[PDB]
Design a protein around this ligand. Structure first.
Ligand SMILES: CCCCCCCC/C=C\CCCCCCCC(=O)OC[C@H](CO)OC(=O)CCCCCCCCCCCCCCC
Ligand SMILES: CCCCCCCC/C=C\CCCCCCCC(=O)OC[C@H](CO)OC(=O)CCCCCCCCCCCCCCC
Ligand SMILES: CC(C)CCC[C@@H](C)[C@H]1CC[C@H]2[C@@H]3CC=C4C[C@@H](OC(=O)CCC(=O)O)CC[C@]4(C)[C@H]3CC[C@]12C
Ligand SMILES: CC(C)CCC[C@@H](C)[C@H]1CC[C@H]2[C@@H]3CC=C4C[C@@H](OC(=O)CCC(=O)O)CC[C@]4(C)[C@H]3CC[C@]12C
Ligand SMILES: [Ca+2]
Ligand SMILES: [Ca+2]
Lengths: 150, 686, 686
């Protein structure tokens, strides 16, 4: 609604402190995300499938399904073009790296492969689109000859 | 010249006043409509219940335009309301409430359709709920093939109606929303209904497609409800519910029974099963590729011990280890593999035996093979008994198992028989064609081939090979059909060829090297006999039949030419035409099968995993030596089901609102909204 | 842990007042907007030229909602109008008139887009007409390979810009509307432009798809204008128009030159050609197939008669008959068939010539064949002369004609070289390998193959074989590509096997029956020489190479094994891998080809028919014995073009209106419309 989101702020459920952002990102709404991210937010980091401490073992014991859905939701958020644009210094590199991760996860989480793969393709497309916006060749050079390493 | 055009089947025409009345309704001018009505009451100049060229009356026009204001006006003036409810239900609007509240020849609805049936057909949860709130009933369709009931003997009269009426009933009973609102166990109801509908698809040759579609609707509904699960606690409550032990994945088993593949393949469901399968191998799949191989190989090598431990101390660390499903699979496969290896040792004839001894004492390797054989037998026996013949009979591989085993039995019998009799030794050459030892060897060879090809079943456990195995099976059905046609052609040409060359058959002695047939250095007497002609034609398909076989020694040119021409036509029909056509057909199917490959494979894999999930299992070589509870369970299932249904209905609605285009009816509605609005404002301002 | 989320693309936020102003524009509250504007003047609390985070300023927000009233209000006040015209053009509003009338970084439009270009890219006839009315110019796109101009040779400054800029001009020049409004011969320009765009697609590899899309756009436009023809008079005026005799189907010819296939295949165009083709046989379409057959047969049989009459007295009625195109085709086909029959007789005892007379005298049959051969060559010469090397060369079949004719010439030469220098009659077995007579016979036979294959060309004429011929030809291209891949495979294994067995070569003498090679009863030394290796591997594709060709005489097990493995791998790669792939590839190609076969076939047939429509035609055997007018013609063409363009513009609009869903933006406008009306009414009534 945007207007409504504004009003509410003016005054499933995989979480609640960050669920607004997680949903917005899924809603891929730049405006709403801009509003929400105004207040500092910190999505939890999806621990890798490898962990075995209660960190994950306990959860994977209480509710494996929820845990899995939770992680997918975090990634579905992190892989939102809007969020990458707003929060990442180098949007392209993030898309490259995240696409790689979302693929690995497809292999690991065989159950939700299609989901994790769609997200990967989404990231790949985003980067292509951002390149498509180049207009002169000076820009192309800056982009294709830049490194994130000192 | 010119073709005059006239209205042949003429119908009464609307007077000018009546035309205006209906026109107002289409524009939503309450004022004019109201006035017209009032005047009609006085001067009786308009039949309030007049009809348009399309047969729509005023109330029907109002219903379609969805103008409840005008509808009320018309109803207050007591307009014929026949079938109006049905039209409203089809439009799926809240005008239904008004008509129901307003309670007390041409129709677009057959005489059988009832308010609830149509609501079900529309799948509008709200309208259905409204109707059900008031007593409503859908006739129970008689069981498939219920001739006993003379009522079914009504088919003699207006079968068309009978058939349509039945389909309408099922089309309603199979509405996701009705099943949701009415059925106590929505999932089980869908499973069952989807099966009955499939059966009907077969019995009712015509209307097959409809019944099949309705069946898929039911199947998908069940998967969709499962998809609305959010926690493992729910998923477990659903999949382990027994209608009436528990914790036996009862519902999953029912699904497998009703071939509910999509349900059994749902990601979350597959996840649970995996946890059960790889118990004891945390992240076995995650284990590095090699690591997996390592563990599997090691466990396999230790299969006899693990087996022995279970035999010794069921309640021991080792004894318990074999109970794990994945371990059983590893062991039960390693056992079979060793069996096959033993059979290979025979090839190399590691234990060589004289070719002259009739019925020799079973060789060393044989003895070793004997146990496994016996184990496999008893195994099949157990399956049959435990599962009942129907189920055992159903399994196709069971046929291969039965055949493989039977061959092994005969082999043994003959081996034995050849021992008691034919106890002496003679040059193999002297042995009669059907010497027991000879026949036994052949049977053994065939059995060995069958045994090794039984490994194909194991492919279902592999992510890569499995899907292929499943697809192949599906295609095989079609290949069989093609084979029947090929056979007919073969028989035809076989009869013909044999008919022409049988006059020129020659003796084996006459033939060089006393060899007669298509399998001699110089092929001869190929078409002399039907048996030989059939063989020759078969081998020709592979190009192993030389062309010189088409000439008769006496050299009768004409005959030979006809013979070669017949052989040639066969080659063209078989290789150039039929063979190629098979390619096209197989390409068509493979394409389709590919669409549903995963669900098929996963359904198959589950069945396999489930088999091991059970408790009655040891490798073949060592194979042969309170109502309160139910109440609670049901209560929980009902709670979960309630939530699942709730979240499902909502989802469906949301999807429709956001994933549906705007049709012309929508434009007409908006246009009416503005029109009626205009007229009102103008009247007020006027 | 946690992943921090911070905004790095920091952006200023609009003041509440500002933000509010923008919201009012979106809702269409003229009043509030008006107030805000006035207050901002005096108070200066809101920059009227502020922007949304999405870069939507007020004027832009108004243009998109298409509220010209608010637009005027905003424009009246001093609101920056940068690039607004472009937005008003992209959206295709005619509120562009207002902006054009007013005249007092991070842009969504590249710095090169000028209003005229954008309008053209949108293809709005109206909007374009407005702008064009005012003097407007689109830069010339320097021709392909115009590197000479240092202007383009300075692309080093910014290539991407240069390339993009170039595409934008063409994307504009290739707009059907701009070509309708600004070009004198809309049809010719589209033909030419289509070609250039095609060529550019090739030179500019990147943007290939874009240029190709544009070319198709131009081709479709020309066809559509043609389809707007409503009388045969118009169709003639168009197809027979010469830009600069007339009445020669000039534009039809140019269309064939530029490969405007669709234009040529257009129903009407085809119909006209047909009438010209079947002149002399009106109703030939109605003629019963049998009747037709009869007519064709008679004419063909009498071909010599008709052929002569013309020569003697073209004016003679009979002379007139052969001039008709369809006739020419029939006569010319009969001549070819007669020729082919002559060739067949040559291989028979028709003349029963001796077979040991080295340098024999030409037989009667050969003598008769000579005239035809001469005619065919002469025809080719004329073709080259009357069509230029380019056209002749372009034709694929002219290649075969050349080959056939050249061989039928070398045959003659060698025959002569043999009549001389060979007066004896030595035994054929004594003749050397390259005896001229032997070489001559070989060439003649090869040509007889080519000659008989030329008949495939005639298929284009039939409505059934024609399309098939075309489709197959296209698929041949695909096969050719595959052969390249295979060739490398062949070469690899050829070299390997030769490198392994070349040591074990043996003299033919040693071999049985003094025969050395794959074409000997006992295939021997098949891999000893490279050439044999290539041939042997080639034949192995057809299973004509025996496996005993891989065993060295000395029986070196290792070498033989390596060889067999190499041969086997080749067979797997070629027969089981590449071959099966080719099949799949071809399957796909046919599916696609089949779709365009008709346009492809009709274009082909028209070229054939056109060939005969021309006046210079006699069968091969008897082959070798005003400014005023221009102005009027052009006026007529312009008249027809005016009508066609008008009809086209209207038709395209109708199609756009009747075939385009209501996008979301459309909805937004309606909502804004109601909103504005609401505010206005509320105020007046409040
Ligand atoms: C399903 C079943 C229904 C299909 C029905 C009919 C299919 C068409 C049957 C045509 C068979 C005719 C061939 C018989 C024959 O020629 O005998 C040879 C015999 C062998 O002596 O030779 C002859 O009789 C005369 C020599 C002429 C041979 C050339 C005939 C070519 C005909 C087409 C061949 C197609 C090959 C295509 C490969 C790409
Ligand atoms: C494009 C080019 C790149 C393709 C690259 C590679 C493709 C795979 C090449 C594999 C070729 C191996 C076969 C060579 C060979 O066996 O020599 C026989 C030779 C003949 O002496 O026999 C042997 O060397 C050993 C006997 C084992 C034969 C069984 C091997 C089976 C391997 C697969 C066969 C597939 C057939 C499929 C038909 C449905
Ligand atoms: C290719 C030639 C040498 C024939 C080899 C015969 C056997 C040694 C192969 C043929 C099929 C193979 C089986 C194919 C399927 C599987 C599934 C595989 O499991 C998986 O791939 C995923 C893990 C899981 O099973 O849960 C375990 C090995 C096994 C039984 C394979 C064991 C080795 C088999 C019996
Ligand atoms: C099948 C075997 C016996 C080879 C026969 C060789 C020729 C006798 C055949 C092969 C292709 C045939 C040609 C295929 C195409 C045509 C088009 C056909 O015209 C039509 O089908 C439609 C009427 C029209 O041409 O306008 C006239 C006969 C002709 C020349 C056919 C004449 C007879 C041909 C030369
Ligand atoms: Ca079994
Ligand atoms: Ca030519």
């Amino acid at each position: 609604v945007v207007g409504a989101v504004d009003i509410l702020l003016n005054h499933y459920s995989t979480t609640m402190d960050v669920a607004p952002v997680i949903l917005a990102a899924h809603r891929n709404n730049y405006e709403i995300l801009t509003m929400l991210l105004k207040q500092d937010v910190s999505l939890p980091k999806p621990h890798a499938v490898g962990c075995e401490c209660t960190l994950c073992s306990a959860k994977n014991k209480k509710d494996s399904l929820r845990h899995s859905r939770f992680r997918l939701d975090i990634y579905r958020c992190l892989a939102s073009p809007a969020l990458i644009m707003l929060t990442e210094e180098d949007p392209i590199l993030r898309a490259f790296e995240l696409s790689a991760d979302l693929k690995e996860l497809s292999l690991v989480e065989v159950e939700f492969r299609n989901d994790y793969e769609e997200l990967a393709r989404q990231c790949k497309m985003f980067a292509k689109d951002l390149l498509a916006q180049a207009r002169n060749s000076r820009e192309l050079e800056v982009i294709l000859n830049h490194t994130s390493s000192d | 010249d010119r073709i005059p055009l006239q209205i042949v089947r003429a119908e009464t025409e609307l007077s000018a006043e009546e035309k205006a009345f209906l026109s107002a309704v289409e524009k939503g001018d309450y004022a004019t409509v109201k006035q017209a009505l009032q005047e009609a009451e006085i001067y009786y100049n308009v039949n309030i219940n007049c009809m348009d060229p399309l047969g729509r009356s005023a109330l029907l026009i109002a219903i379609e335009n969805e103008n409840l204001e005008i509808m009320e006006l018309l109803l207050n003036h007591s307009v014929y309301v026949g079938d109006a409810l049905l039209y409203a239900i089809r439009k799926e609007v809240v005008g239904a409430v008004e008509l129901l509240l307003s309670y007390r020849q041409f129709s677009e609805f057959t005489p059988d359709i009832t308010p609830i049936m149509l609501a079900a057909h529309t799948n509008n949860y709200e309208i259905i709920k409204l109707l059900v709130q008031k007593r409503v009933t859908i006739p129970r369709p008689h069981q498939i093939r219920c001739n006993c009931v003379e009522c079914v003997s009504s088919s003699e009269v207006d079968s068309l109606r009978h058939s349509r009426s039945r389909l309408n009933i099922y089309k309603a009973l199979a509405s996701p929303s009705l099943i949701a609102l009415s059925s106590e166990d929505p999932i089980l109801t869908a499973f069952r209904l989807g099966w009955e509908l499939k059966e009907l698809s077969k019995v009712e040759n015509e209307f097959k497609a409809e019944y099949e579609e309705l069946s898929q609707q039911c199947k998908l509904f069940a998967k969709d409800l499962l998809d609305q699960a959010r926690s493992s606690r729910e998923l477990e409550i659903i999949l382990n519910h027994r209608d009436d032990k528990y914790h036996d994945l009862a519902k999953l088993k029912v699904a497998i029974k009703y071939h509910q593949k999509e349900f059994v393949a749902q990601p979350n469901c597959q996840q649970l099963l995996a946890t059960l399968w790889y118990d004891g191998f945390p992240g076995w799949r995650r284990k590095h590729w090699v690591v997996k191989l390592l563990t599997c190989m090691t466990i396999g090598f230790l299969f006899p011990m693990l087996s022995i431990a279970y035999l010794i101390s069921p309640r021991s660390n080792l004894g318990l280890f074999i109970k794990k499903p994945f371990i059983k699979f590893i062991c039960h496969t390693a056992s079979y593999l060793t069996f096959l290896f033993m059979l290979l040792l025979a090839s190399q004839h590691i234990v060589r035996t004289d070719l002259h001894v009739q019925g020799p004492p079973p060789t060393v390797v044989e003895w070793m093979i004997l146990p496994w054989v016996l184990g496999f037998i008893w195994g099949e026996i157990k399956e049959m008994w435990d599962g009942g013949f129907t189920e055992y009979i159903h399994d196709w591989w069971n046929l291969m198992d039965f055949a493989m085993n039977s061959l092994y039995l005969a082999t043994i019998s003959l081996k034995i028989v050849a021992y008691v009799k034919y106890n002496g030794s003679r040059p193999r050459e002297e042995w009669e064609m059907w010497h027991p030892t000879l026949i036994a060897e052949a049977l053994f060879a065939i059995s060995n081939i069958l045994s090794s090809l039984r490994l194909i079943s194991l492919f279902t456990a592999n992510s890569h090979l499995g899907p292929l195995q499943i697809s192949l099976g599906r295609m095989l059905l079609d290949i069989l059909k093609f084979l029947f046609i090929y056979c007919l052609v073969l028989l035809a040409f076989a009869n013909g060829l044999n008919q022409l060359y049988f006059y020129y058959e020659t003796r084996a002695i006459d033939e060089p090297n006393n060899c007669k047939g298509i399998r001699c250095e110089k092929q001869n007497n190929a078409f002399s006999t039907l048996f030989e002609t059939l063989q020759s034609l078969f081998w020709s398909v592979f190009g192993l039949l030389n062309l010189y076989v088409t000439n008769v020694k006496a050299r009768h040119e004409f005959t030979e030419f006809v013979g070669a021409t017949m052989f040639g036509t066969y080659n063209v029909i078989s290789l150039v035409v039929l063979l190629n056509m098979l390619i096209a057909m197989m390409n068509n199917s493979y394409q389709l099968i590919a669409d549903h490959a995963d669900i098929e494979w996963k359904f198959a894999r589950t069945k396999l995993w489930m088999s091991y999930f059970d408790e009655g299992g040891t490798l073949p070589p060592p194979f042969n030596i309170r109502h309160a509870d139910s109440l609670i369970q049901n209560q929980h299932y009902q709670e979960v089901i309630r939530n699942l249904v709730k979240r499902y209905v909502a989802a469906m609605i949301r999807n429709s609102k956001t994933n549906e285009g705007l049709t012309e009816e929508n434009f007409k509605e908006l246009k009416q909204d503005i029109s009626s609005f205009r007229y009102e404002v103008l009247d007020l301002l006027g």
